[PDB]
Amino acid sequence: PEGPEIRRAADNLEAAIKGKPLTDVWFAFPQLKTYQSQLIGQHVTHVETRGKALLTHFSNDLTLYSHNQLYGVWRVVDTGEEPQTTRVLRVKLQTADKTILLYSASDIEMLRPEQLTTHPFLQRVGPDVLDPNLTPEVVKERLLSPRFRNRQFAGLLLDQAFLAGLGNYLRVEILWQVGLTGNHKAKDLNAAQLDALAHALLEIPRFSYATRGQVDALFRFKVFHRDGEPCERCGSIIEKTTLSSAPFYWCPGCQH
DNA sequence: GCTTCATCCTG
DNA sequence: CAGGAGAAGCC
Ligand SMILES: [Zn+2]
């Protein structure tokens, strides 16, 4: 679940309960139980995302921070209904007609304003690829800054301190799109390559967000999990190798 | 960057 | 039933 999936989730959560008075609130964690009575009657004002971090803001200035990491998942159901699953329920925010449920996630914390501005993660993450204000220009600027210009892409594209929201599938799909291997550094690219990379870093995540689900051609994986299969661009056989602690899918025939 | 955490999926 | 699929740890 990378930036695009998380924003899609957040949009569904907002459509479900944004602005509606909470009729019941439940948290699995003992440390969060105290907030149950405090939030009943309040309402979610908006669901903000920063990369894969999701922030559910409430009308009393509290904010529930949740990060699904590799296994958390939200579900929208009609109030009263309980999904058929073996997953562990961690949060229930219920309104008159709709209820949202967070399953499996382990990183869940209730934040006060002071904790928001200085949260370790929220404080170290870089600009969000889904942020409309972020442009290819600013992205190029970032890639060439002394801070990132010498970083190999294999690790850079997974680092949320560079651009928030990029995960392993976006990492491999972006690099394949621009024909680059994971060992490249922004400082060694020619102007044409840097431009393509800069645009792809924003356009692919935004394309997945807009079309992988919901919609309104369609996003699809070109190399992610297609190792052993022929590249649709050059026909070479896609390979898989571990780079920066995550499986790197790439085509030796058109990625250089 | 390497290892550990943490939950569900998979060979 | 290992260990594969995004952090925090360890600072
Ligand atoms: Zn190819």
Side-chain angles (χ1 to χ4, degrees), chain A residues 1-108 110-113 115-256:
Chain A
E2 310 188 10
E5 295 64 43
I6 298 303
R7 188 57 253 181
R8 279 168 56 202
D11 296 334
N12 290 334
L13 300 188
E14 290 193 312
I17 69 168
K18 179 181 178 180
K20 305 180 180 177
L22 293 163
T23 52
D24 196 45
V25 176
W26 182 91
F27 295 110
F29 296 165
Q31 303 78 194
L32 296 178
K33 291 290 187 182
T34 182
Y35 298 113
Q36 292 180 170
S37 55
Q38 185 173 3
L39 289 168
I40 295 176
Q42 296 296 316
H43 60 274
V44 172
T45 55
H46 67 287
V47 180
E48 165 182 32
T49 51
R50 296 189 182 181
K52 300 157 214 173
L54 193 141
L55 307 171
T56 303
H57 293 77
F58 298 107
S59 51
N60 62 358
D61 296 306
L62 290 178
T63 301
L64 183 66
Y65 168 100
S66 59
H67 195 303
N68 294 168
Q69 300 186 86
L70 287 172
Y71 42 76
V73 297
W74 284 90
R75 175 154 192 172
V76 178
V77 304
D78 294 304
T79 297
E81 300 302 298
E82 217 171 291
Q84 172 175 49
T85 180
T86 50
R87 280 174 176 277
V88 60
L89 183 64
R90 288 284 160 76
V91 183
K92 189 243 297 194
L93 293 173
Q94 176 181 321
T95 65
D97 64 320
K98 307 228 73 297
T99 291
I100 59 175
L101 309 166
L102 174 54
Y103 289 88
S104 318
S106 60
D107 188 349
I108 306 170
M110 190 60 76
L111 305 176
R112 287 163 64 178
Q115 292 173 288
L116 201 303
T117 53
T118 56
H119 183 285
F121 181 80
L122 302 177
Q123 191 170 66
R124 303 172 188 174
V125 298
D128 193 317
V129 296
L130 301 186
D131 185 340
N133 301 307
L134 187 60
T135 67
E137 311 70 75
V138 171
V139 174
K140 292 190 190 176
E141 206 164 306
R142 200 173 185 78
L143 284 158
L144 295 177
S145 63
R147 180 187 180 184
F148 298 120
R149 59 169 41 263
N150 191 57
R151 292 278 298 284
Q152 281 183 287
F153 298 148
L156 185 69
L157 272 49
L158 294 181
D159 194 325
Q160 303 306 287
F162 170 58
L163 289 179
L166 302 181
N168 197 42
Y169 89 65
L170 287 172
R171 161 220 223 188
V172 304
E173 296 294 319
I174 286 163
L175 293 177
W176 177 90
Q177 177 56 43
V178 306
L180 296 171
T181 51
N183 44 49
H184 280 285
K185 300 177 179 299
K187 71 173 185 179
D188 69 19
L189 303 175
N190 60 51
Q193 299 181 295
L194 199 176
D195 189 66
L197 213 215
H199 283 73
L201 283 162
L202 299 180
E203 308 185 317
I204 291 182
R206 291 171 189 181
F207 183 42
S208 175
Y209 169 62
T211 65
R212 193 180 178 194
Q214 210 274 175
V215 101
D216 289 59
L218 290 62
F219 176 85
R220 59 188 177 66
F221 298 123
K222 307 293 181 64
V223 295
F224 188 57
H225 278 284
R226 298 181 68 74
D227 53 307
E229 302 174 54
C231 176
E232 68 177 63
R233 164 196 284 154
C234 78
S236 288
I237 301 304
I238 287 68
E239 286 173 42
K240 180 188 69 178
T241 189
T242 300
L243 278 190
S244 300
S245 295
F248 190 74
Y249 296 88
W250 68 296
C251 177
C254 63
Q255 278 179 267
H256 307 281

mmCIF file of all heavy atoms in Angstrom, chain A residues 74-108, unseen atoms left out:
data_model
loop_
_atom_site.group_PDB
_atom_site.id
_atom_site.type_symbol
_atom_site.label_atom_id
_atom_site.label_comp_id
_atom_site.label_asym_id
_atom_site.label_seq_id
_atom_site.Cartn_x
_atom_site.Cartn_y
_atom_site.Cartn_z
ATOM 1 N N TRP A 74 -7.952 -0.309 5.733
ATOM 2 C CA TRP A 74 -9.198 0.301 6.184
ATOM 3 C C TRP A 74 -10.356 -0.296 5.406
ATOM 4 O O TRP A 74 -10.197 -0.751 4.267
ATOM 5 C CB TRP A 74 -9.239 1.811 5.928
ATOM 6 C CG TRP A 74 -8.433 2.645 6.853
ATOM 7 C CD1 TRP A 74 -7.134 3.022 6.692
ATOM 8 C CD2 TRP A 74 -8.879 3.236 8.079
ATOM 9 N NE1 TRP A 74 -6.739 3.816 7.740
ATOM 10 C CE2 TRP A 74 -7.790 3.965 8.608
ATOM 11 C CE3 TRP A 74 -10.094 3.222 8.784
ATOM 12 C CZ2 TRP A 74 -7.874 4.675 9.811
ATOM 13 C CZ3 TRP A 74 -10.177 3.932 9.989
ATOM 14 C CH2 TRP A 74 -9.071 4.647 10.485
ATOM 15 N N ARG A 75 -11.528 -0.278 6.024
ATOM 16 C CA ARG A 75 -12.726 -0.772 5.381
ATOM 17 C C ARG A 75 -13.900 0.121 5.737
ATOM 18 O O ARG A 75 -14.027 0.572 6.871
ATOM 19 C CB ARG A 75 -13.031 -2.208 5.804
ATOM 20 C CG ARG A 75 -14.346 -2.701 5.233
ATOM 21 C CD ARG A 75 -14.387 -4.205 5.077
ATOM 22 N NE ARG A 75 -15.531 -4.605 4.267
ATOM 23 C CZ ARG A 75 -15.744 -5.840 3.831
ATOM 24 N NH1 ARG A 75 -14.886 -6.805 4.126
ATOM 25 N NH2 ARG A 75 -16.813 -6.105 3.092
ATOM 26 N N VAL A 76 -14.743 0.385 4.747
ATOM 27 C CA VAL A 76 -15.932 1.209 4.946
ATOM 28 C C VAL A 76 -17.139 0.281 4.903
ATOM 29 O O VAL A 76 -17.333 -0.438 3.923
ATOM 30 C CB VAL A 76 -16.098 2.252 3.829
ATOM 31 C CG1 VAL A 76 -17.369 3.055 4.058
ATOM 32 C CG2 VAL A 76 -14.887 3.163 3.779
ATOM 33 N N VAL A 77 -17.941 0.291 5.964
ATOM 34 C CA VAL A 77 -19.123 -0.558 6.027
ATOM 35 C C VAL A 77 -20.321 0.230 6.531
ATOM 36 O O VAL A 77 -20.174 1.357 7.015
ATOM 37 C CB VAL A 77 -18.911 -1.762 6.976
ATOM 38 C CG1 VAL A 77 -17.696 -2.557 6.539
ATOM 39 C CG2 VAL A 77 -18.753 -1.283 8.426
ATOM 40 N N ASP A 78 -21.509 -0.355 6.395
ATOM 41 C CA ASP A 78 -22.718 0.291 6.888
ATOM 42 C C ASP A 78 -22.725 0.038 8.386
ATOM 43 O O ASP A 78 -22.396 -1.056 8.836
ATOM 44 C CB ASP A 78 -23.975 -0.319 6.260
ATOM 45 C CG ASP A 78 -24.064 -0.068 4.771
ATOM 46 O OD1 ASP A 78 -24.021 1.108 4.357
ATOM 47 O OD2 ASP A 78 -24.183 -1.051 4.011
ATOM 48 N N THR A 79 -23.100 1.049 9.158
ATOM 49 C CA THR A 79 -23.124 0.917 10.607
ATOM 50 C C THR A 79 -23.868 -0.319 11.113
ATOM 51 O O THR A 79 -24.985 -0.612 10.685
ATOM 52 C CB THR A 79 -23.713 2.190 11.240
ATOM 53 O OG1 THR A 79 -22.847 3.291 10.937
ATOM 54 C CG2 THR A 79 -23.843 2.042 12.756
ATOM 55 N N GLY A 80 -23.221 -1.039 12.029
ATOM 56 C CA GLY A 80 -23.797 -2.241 12.604
ATOM 57 C C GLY A 80 -23.228 -3.512 12.000
ATOM 58 O O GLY A 80 -23.167 -4.553 12.661
ATOM 59 N N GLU A 81 -22.807 -3.423 10.742
ATOM 60 C CA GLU A 81 -22.248 -4.560 10.021
ATOM 61 C C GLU A 81 -20.803 -4.858 10.401
ATOM 62 O O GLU A 81 -19.985 -3.953 10.543
ATOM 63 C CB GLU A 81 -22.339 -4.315 8.515
ATOM 64 C CG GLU A 81 -23.762 -4.120 8.008
ATOM 65 C CD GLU A 81 -24.665 -5.304 8.317
ATOM 66 O OE1 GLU A 81 -24.377 -6.419 7.832
ATOM 67 O OE2 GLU A 81 -25.660 -5.118 9.046
ATOM 68 N N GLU A 82 -20.494 -6.142 10.546
ATOM 69 C CA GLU A 82 -19.152 -6.573 10.905
ATOM 70 C C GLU A 82 -18.586 -7.469 9.802
ATOM 71 O O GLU A 82 -19.094 -8.564 9.555
ATOM 72 C CB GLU A 82 -19.201 -7.324 12.238
ATOM 73 C CG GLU A 82 -18.012 -7.064 13.139
ATOM 74 C CD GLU A 82 -18.196 -7.649 14.527
ATOM 75 O OE1 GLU A 82 -19.053 -7.137 15.286
ATOM 76 O OE2 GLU A 82 -17.483 -8.623 14.854
ATOM 77 N N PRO A 83 -17.537 -6.992 9.142
ATOM 78 C CA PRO A 83 -16.900 -7.726 8.050
ATOM 79 C C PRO A 83 -16.458 -9.132 8.443
ATOM 80 O O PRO A 83 -16.057 -9.373 9.580
ATOM 81 C CB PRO A 83 -15.700 -6.935 7.531
ATOM 82 N N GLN A 84 -16.538 -10.056 7.489
ATOM 83 C CA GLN A 84 -16.126 -11.442 7.709
ATOM 84 C C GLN A 84 -14.625 -11.531 7.447
ATOM 85 O O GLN A 84 -14.192 -11.635 6.297
ATOM 86 C CB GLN A 84 -16.885 -12.376 6.758
ATOM 87 C CG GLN A 84 -16.393 -13.813 6.765
ATOM 88 C CD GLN A 84 -17.241 -14.725 5.892
ATOM 89 O OE1 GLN A 84 -17.530 -14.408 4.735
ATOM 90 N NE2 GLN A 84 -17.636 -15.868 6.441
ATOM 91 N N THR A 85 -13.835 -11.494 8.515
ATOM 92 C CA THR A 85 -12.382 -11.529 8.382
ATOM 93 C C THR A 85 -11.686 -12.027 9.642
ATOM 94 O O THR A 85 -12.231 -11.936 10.741
ATOM 95 C CB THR A 85 -11.845 -10.118 8.061
ATOM 96 O OG1 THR A 85 -10.418 -10.153 7.932
ATOM 97 C CG2 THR A 85 -12.223 -9.151 9.179
ATOM 98 N N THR A 86 -10.478 -12.554 9.476
ATOM 99 C CA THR A 86 -9.699 -13.038 10.607
ATOM 100 C C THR A 86 -8.697 -11.971 11.042
ATOM 101 O O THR A 86 -7.948 -12.165 12.000
ATOM 102 C CB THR A 86 -8.932 -14.330 10.261
ATOM 103 O OG1 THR A 86 -8.207 -14.145 9.041
ATOM 104 C CG2 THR A 86 -9.896 -15.498 10.111
ATOM 105 N N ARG A 87 -8.685 -10.845 10.328
ATOM 106 C CA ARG A 87 -7.788 -9.737 10.653
ATOM 107 C C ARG A 87 -8.171 -9.141 12.001
ATOM 108 O O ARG A 87 -9.333 -9.192 12.391
ATOM 109 C CB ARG A 87 -7.882 -8.639 9.588
ATOM 110 C CG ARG A 87 -7.089 -8.910 8.320
ATOM 111 C CD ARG A 87 -7.367 -7.843 7.275
ATOM 112 N NE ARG A 87 -6.555 -8.013 6.075
ATOM 113 C CZ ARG A 87 -5.305 -7.582 5.937
ATOM 114 N NH1 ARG A 87 -4.695 -6.941 6.930
ATOM 115 N NH2 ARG A 87 -4.659 -7.794 4.797
ATOM 116 N N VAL A 88 -7.195 -8.569 12.700
ATOM 117 C CA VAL A 88 -7.438 -7.957 14.001
ATOM 118 C C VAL A 88 -7.921 -6.516 13.845
ATOM 119 O O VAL A 88 -7.262 -5.690 13.204
ATOM 120 C CB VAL A 88 -6.160 -7.979 14.874
ATOM 121 C CG1 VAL A 88 -5.040 -7.217 14.188
ATOM 122 C CG2 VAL A 88 -6.447 -7.386 16.240
ATOM 123 N N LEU A 89 -9.080 -6.219 14.429
ATOM 124 C CA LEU A 89 -9.636 -4.874 14.353
ATOM 125 C C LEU A 89 -8.869 -3.978 15.313
ATOM 126 O O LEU A 89 -8.645 -4.346 16.468
ATOM 127 C CB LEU A 89 -11.123 -4.885 14.726
ATOM 128 C CG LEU A 89 -11.820 -3.531 14.603
ATOM 129 C CD1 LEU A 89 -11.827 -3.094 13.145
ATOM 130 C CD2 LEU A 89 -13.246 -3.631 15.149
ATOM 131 N N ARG A 90 -8.478 -2.797 14.845
ATOM 132 C CA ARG A 90 -7.712 -1.878 15.673
ATOM 133 C C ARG A 90 -8.423 -0.555 15.965
ATOM 134 O O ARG A 90 -8.166 0.072 16.993
ATOM 135 C CB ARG A 90 -6.342 -1.620 15.018
ATOM 136 C CG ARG A 90 -5.376 -2.821 15.105
ATOM 137 C CD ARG A 90 -4.798 -2.916 16.515
ATOM 138 N NE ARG A 90 -4.254 -4.230 16.880
ATOM 139 C CZ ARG A 90 -3.088 -4.724 16.472
ATOM 140 N NH1 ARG A 90 -2.304 -4.032 15.657
ATOM 141 N NH2 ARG A 90 -2.687 -5.910 16.918
ATOM 142 N N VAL A 91 -9.322 -0.145 15.071
ATOM 143 C CA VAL A 91 -10.054 1.110 15.245
ATOM 144 C C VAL A 91 -11.438 1.066 14.620
ATOM 145 O O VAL A 91 -11.624 0.523 13.527
ATOM 146 C CB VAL A 91 -9.324 2.310 14.573
ATOM 147 C CG1 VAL A 91 -10.093 3.610 14.841
ATOM 148 C CG2 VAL A 91 -7.896 2.426 15.073
ATOM 149 N N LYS A 92 -12.415 1.630 15.322
ATOM 150 C CA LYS A 92 -13.756 1.724 14.783
ATOM 151 C C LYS A 92 -14.248 3.142 15.026
ATOM 152 O O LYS A 92 -14.316 3.595 16.173
ATOM 153 C CB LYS A 92 -14.721 0.739 15.451
ATOM 154 C CG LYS A 92 -16.074 0.680 14.738
ATOM 155 C CD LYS A 92 -17.233 1.136 15.602
ATOM 156 C CE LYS A 92 -17.431 0.242 16.809
ATOM 157 N NZ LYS A 92 -18.753 0.478 17.466
ATOM 158 N N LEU A 93 -14.569 3.845 13.943
ATOM 159 C CA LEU A 93 -15.103 5.202 14.023
ATOM 160 C C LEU A 93 -16.481 5.074 13.375
ATOM 161 O O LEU A 93 -16.604 4.917 12.157
ATOM 162 C CB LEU A 93 -14.201 6.181 13.264
ATOM 163 C CG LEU A 93 -12.807 6.385 13.885
ATOM 164 C CD1 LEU A 93 -11.947 7.241 12.963
ATOM 165 C CD2 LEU A 93 -12.932 7.048 15.255
ATOM 166 N N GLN A 94 -17.513 5.128 14.210
ATOM 167 C CA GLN A 94 -18.883 4.926 13.775
ATOM 168 C C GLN A 94 -19.777 6.160 13.784
ATOM 169 O O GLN A 94 -19.748 6.950 14.722
ATOM 170 C CB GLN A 94 -19.490 3.832 14.668
ATOM 171 C CG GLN A 94 -20.961 3.501 14.469
ATOM 172 C CD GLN A 94 -21.427 2.422 15.448
ATOM 173 O OE1 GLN A 94 -20.695 1.476 15.728
ATOM 174 N NE2 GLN A 94 -22.646 2.556 15.956
ATOM 175 N N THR A 95 -20.561 6.317 12.719
ATOM 176 C CA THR A 95 -21.513 7.419 12.617
ATOM 177 C C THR A 95 -22.868 6.757 12.391
ATOM 178 O O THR A 95 -22.957 5.535 12.293
ATOM 179 C CB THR A 95 -21.205 8.371 11.440
ATOM 180 O OG1 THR A 95 -21.366 7.677 10.197
ATOM 181 C CG2 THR A 95 -19.790 8.908 11.548
ATOM 182 N N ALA A 96 -23.922 7.555 12.298
ATOM 183 C CA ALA A 96 -25.261 7.005 12.120
ATOM 184 C C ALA A 96 -25.419 5.973 11.001
ATOM 185 O O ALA A 96 -25.948 4.884 11.227
ATOM 186 C CB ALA A 96 -26.262 8.142 11.915
ATOM 187 N N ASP A 97 -24.963 6.306 9.799
ATOM 188 C CA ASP A 97 -25.126 5.386 8.679
ATOM 189 C C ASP A 97 -23.871 4.661 8.215
ATOM 190 O O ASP A 97 -23.963 3.555 7.691
ATOM 191 C CB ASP A 97 -25.769 6.124 7.499
ATOM 192 C CG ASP A 97 -24.901 7.238 6.962
ATOM 193 O OD1 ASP A 97 -24.283 7.957 7.773
ATOM 194 O OD2 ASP A 97 -24.845 7.402 5.724
ATOM 195 N N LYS A 98 -22.699 5.261 8.407
ATOM 196 C CA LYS A 98 -21.466 4.608 7.975
ATOM 197 C C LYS A 98 -20.433 4.465 9.087
ATOM 198 O O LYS A 98 -20.379 5.279 10.009
ATOM 199 C CB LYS A 98 -20.848 5.370 6.802
ATOM 200 C CG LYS A 98 -21.810 5.599 5.644
ATOM 201 C CD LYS A 98 -21.182 5.238 4.305
ATOM 202 C CE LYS A 98 -21.049 3.732 4.128
ATOM 203 N NZ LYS A 98 -20.148 3.102 5.127
ATOM 204 N N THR A 99 -19.614 3.424 8.982
ATOM 205 C CA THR A 99 -18.574 3.156 9.965
ATOM 206 C C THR A 99 -17.289 2.810 9.218
ATOM 207 O O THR A 99 -17.327 2.134 8.189
ATOM 208 C CB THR A 99 -18.946 1.958 10.879
ATOM 209 O OG1 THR A 99 -20.035 2.325 11.739
ATOM 210 C CG2 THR A 99 -17.763 1.545 11.734
ATOM 211 N N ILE A 100 -16.156 3.299 9.708
ATOM 212 C CA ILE A 100 -14.889 2.955 9.081
ATOM 213 C C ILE A 100 -14.112 2.117 10.084
ATOM 214 O O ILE A 100 -14.148 2.377 11.295
ATOM 215 C CB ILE A 100 -14.087 4.197 8.641
ATOM 216 C CG1 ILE A 100 -13.793 5.113 9.824
ATOM 217 C CG2 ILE A 100 -14.876 4.949 7.574
ATOM 218 C CD1 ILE A 100 -12.899 6.284 9.451
ATOM 219 N N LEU A 101 -13.439 1.093 9.571
ATOM 220 C CA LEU A 101 -12.691 0.159 10.396
ATOM 221 C C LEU A 101 -11.243 0.057 9.935
ATOM 222 O O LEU A 101 -10.977 -0.044 8.735
ATOM 223 C CB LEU A 101 -13.345 -1.230 10.304
ATOM 224 C CG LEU A 101 -14.856 -1.293 10.566
ATOM 225 C CD1 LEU A 101 -15.436 -2.634 10.110
ATOM 226 C CD2 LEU A 101 -15.102 -1.064 12.051
ATOM 227 N N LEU A 102 -10.315 0.103 10.886
ATOM 228 C CA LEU A 102 -8.898 -0.042 10.570
ATOM 229 C C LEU A 102 -8.459 -1.383 11.129
ATOM 230 O O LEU A 102 -8.551 -1.621 12.338
ATOM 231 C CB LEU A 102 -8.051 1.065 11.210
ATOM 232 C CG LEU A 102 -6.533 0.892 11.040
ATOM 233 C CD1 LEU A 102 -6.178 0.730 9.556
ATOM 234 C CD2 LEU A 102 -5.810 2.099 11.620
ATOM 235 N N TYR A 103 -7.993 -2.262 10.245
ATOM 236 C CA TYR A 103 -7.534 -3.581 10.655
ATOM 237 C C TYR A 103 -6.032 -3.733 10.554
ATOM 238 O O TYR A 103 -5.391 -3.101 9.716
ATOM 239 C CB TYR A 103 -8.130 -4.676 9.765
ATOM 240 C CG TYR A 103 -9.601 -4.939 9.943
ATOM 241 C CD1 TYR A 103 -10.548 -4.227 9.215
ATOM 242 C CD2 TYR A 103 -10.048 -5.926 10.825
ATOM 243 C CE1 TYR A 103 -11.903 -4.487 9.353
ATOM 244 C CE2 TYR A 103 -11.407 -6.192 10.973
ATOM 245 C CZ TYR A 103 -12.324 -5.470 10.233
ATOM 246 O OH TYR A 103 -13.666 -5.729 10.363
ATOM 247 N N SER A 104 -5.489 -4.575 11.428
ATOM 248 C CA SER A 104 -4.079 -4.947 11.404
ATOM 249 C C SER A 104 -2.979 -3.936 11.699
ATOM 250 O O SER A 104 -1.956 -4.295 12.279
ATOM 251 C CB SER A 104 -3.802 -5.608 10.056
ATOM 252 O OG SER A 104 -4.876 -6.476 9.720
ATOM 253 N N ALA A 105 -3.166 -2.685 11.296
ATOM 254 C CA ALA A 105 -2.147 -1.668 11.532
ATOM 255 C C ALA A 105 -1.664 -1.679 12.985
ATOM 256 O O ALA A 105 -2.461 -1.850 13.909
ATOM 257 C CB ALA A 105 -2.693 -0.284 11.165
ATOM 258 N N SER A 106 -0.360 -1.494 13.178
ATOM 259 C CA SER A 106 0.236 -1.495 14.517
ATOM 260 C C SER A 106 0.716 -0.105 14.927
ATOM 261 O O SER A 106 0.869 0.187 16.109
ATOM 262 C CB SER A 106 1.420 -2.466 14.569
ATOM 263 O OG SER A 106 2.431 -2.095 13.642
ATOM 264 N N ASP A 107 0.961 0.746 13.939
ATOM 265 C CA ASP A 107 1.429 2.099 14.205
ATOM 266 C C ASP A 107 0.222 3.030 14.228
ATOM 267 O O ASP A 107 -0.185 3.559 13.196
ATOM 268 C CB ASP A 107 2.408 2.539 13.112
ATOM 269 C CG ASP A 107 3.089 3.856 13.436
ATOM 270 O OD1 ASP A 107 2.659 4.535 14.393
ATOM 271 O OD2 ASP A 107 4.051 4.216 12.726
ATOM 272 N N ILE A 108 -0.349 3.213 15.415
ATOM 273 C CA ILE A 108 -1.511 4.068 15.592
ATOM 274 C C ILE A 108 -1.290 4.909 16.842
ATOM 275 O O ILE A 108 -1.018 4.373 17.915
ATOM 276 C CB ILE A 108 -2.783 3.229 15.783
ATOM 277 C CG1 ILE A 108 -2.936 2.236 14.626
ATOM 278 C CG2 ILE A 108 -3.999 4.133 15.866
ATOM 279 C CD1 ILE A 108 -4.030 1.206 14.854
#
